[PDB]
């Protein structure tokens, strides 16, 4: 017998103790080695309610990634008040590694195995696991990168789609690569990301079709963000320790969703950033020399739907919704912690 409970989880990973890469370093002291003998047990005739939007595992992951970033990033200067803090800022080795979250004695993680589970409500096929799968703590906005894919159809996740204040997480069933590079050796901050537009627009078409299922049949249209800091009006991510900000206007092209080869998004590597962890600005050193390149899988999209639209027969979605916790939610949605009684 068990019931929904929160408890402090621990983490596990395949971190190498000799690595310099900062996630490895962190995990070497914060986590144990990945479960050498993972056991997943199918719970017969058990239906369980899940709610990815109220899941303390998300809170705990957020706390760990904040801690990882706090101890790993080395900004030349950190601005918070009031307080200007200067320090050495050598370039670091930065490449997220998968982290597993595991329950301590007397608790277990239930896992939802329903192929098209949207993140809330009953799950009919439930198993128990000692640890989650390995989740890379990729911090990004607009586009979810390097995550898992939905098994079957594209899934729309939201605590309530009719509620425009709730972020929408689109879970792709096919990834689309995004290939970002700051070429070797003008302007060393200028970069760009290349996306195969043919593949992208196809997927985006499929996304609009799933959204259409949830919204009557309304015309689904994408628009650029209505406002916000650069971290949320651009697709923001960290590649090789450098902070990229890429303009995604071309990625949400309604004309090509109603016509493309390669889409190249203009990016900038920024030294002056707003920190995701806690309010405050940071300044980093100029980009490292050489070819800087990250090829990532787009595995999900965060969206916000325009409110007030009862005149129109359309629904309008803009990239961006929510906060970095939703990145973890996008991977933790299928899990919940339960206490054994």
């Amino acid at each position: 017998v068990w019931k929904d409970a929160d408890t402090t989880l621990f983490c596990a990973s395949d971190a190498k103790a000799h690595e310099t890469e900062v996630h490895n370093v962190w995990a070497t002291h914060a986590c144990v080695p990945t479960d050498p003998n993972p056991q997943e047990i199918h719970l017969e005739n058990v239906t369980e309610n899940f709610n990815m939007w109220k899941n303390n595992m998300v809170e705990q992951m957020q706390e760990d990634v904040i801690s990882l970033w706090d101890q790993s990033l080395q900004p030349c200067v950190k601005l918070t008040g009031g307080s200007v803090i200067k320090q050495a800022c050598p370039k670091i080795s930065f490449d997220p590694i998968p982290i597993h979250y595991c329950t301590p004695a007397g608790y277990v993680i239930l896992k939802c195995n329903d192929k098209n589970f949207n993140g809330t409500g009953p799950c009919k096929n439930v198993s128990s696991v000692q640890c989650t799968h390995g989740i890379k703590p990729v911090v990004s906005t607009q586009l979810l990168l390097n995550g898992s894919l939905a098994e079957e159809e594209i899934i729309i996740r939201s605590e309530n789609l009719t509620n425009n204040a709730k972020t929408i997480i689109v879970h792709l069933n096919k990834s689309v690569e995004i290939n970002c590079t700051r070429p070797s050796n003008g302007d060393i901050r200028k970069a760009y990301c290349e996306i195969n537009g043919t593949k992208w627009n196809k997927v985006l078409k499929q996304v609009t079709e799933k959204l259409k299922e949830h919204f009557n049949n309304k015309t689904i249209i994408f628009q650029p963000p209505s406002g916000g800091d650069l971290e949320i009006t651009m697709h923001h991510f960290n590649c090789r320790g450098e902070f990229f900000y890429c303009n995604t206007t071309q990625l949400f092209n309604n004309t090509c969703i109603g016509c493309n080869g390669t889409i190249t998004l203009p990016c900038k590597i920024k030294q002056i950033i707003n920190m995701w962890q806690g309010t405050g600005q940071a300044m980093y050193a100029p980009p490292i020399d050489g070819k800087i390149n990250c090829v990532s899988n787009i595995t999900g999209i965060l969206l916000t739907r325009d409110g007030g639209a009862n005149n129109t027969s359309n629904e309008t979605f803009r990239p961006g919704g929510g906060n970095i916790k939703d990145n973890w939610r996008s991977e933790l949605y299928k899990y919940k912690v339960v206490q054994i009684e």
Partner: antibody
Amino acid sequence: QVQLLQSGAQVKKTGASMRISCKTSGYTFLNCPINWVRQAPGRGLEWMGWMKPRGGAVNYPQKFQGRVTMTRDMSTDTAFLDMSNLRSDDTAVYFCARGKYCTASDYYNWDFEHWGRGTLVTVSS
Amino acid sequence: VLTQSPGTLSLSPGERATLSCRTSQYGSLAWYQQRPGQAPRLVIYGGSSRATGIPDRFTGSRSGADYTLTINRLEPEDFGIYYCQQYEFFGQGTKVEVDI
């Protein structure tokens, strides 16, 4: 005690811009959206949008896009409503409002238990 | 989205005011009271829950898409315009006229 403190009435010529502040206190500003609602004669109460202090994400109905900007000053826990190119029919009492339920991990935006006192903006030649 | 009725209610203290809001869409329904020259005040949320400090003579109920706010034992200070709300949308308001 949650408090939403609005700035004072304003008078504007048509074509001008206005800016109204809503200084919040009594809770963690970051944790939930701020909303603006205007009370314009003949038009009851009309929601103008929300703004999340984290990142300053916003959501505006289409009719206000291009003229409304909702912004914040994180250092003073203050939200702002800016509206440009004012016209006569922008004359209204402007309220900021916040949901009843707001925690570090969850909120429900729309049960507006908390309202600023309102800011009259009259737009007139 | 939200249709209120009647437009105006003109009642004496001690009487019962029955305010209707008809919805066309999904979502939690709230009622507000707005007295003249004052901010609106939340009265009911989630169709039937009473907001902080709202006297118990205010009650919200729901029948299918039809929501009602009943104000029993009306008082002069109940004068005002009452709005129903669902997410960002507000009804057009029902004016309750009551005085000493």
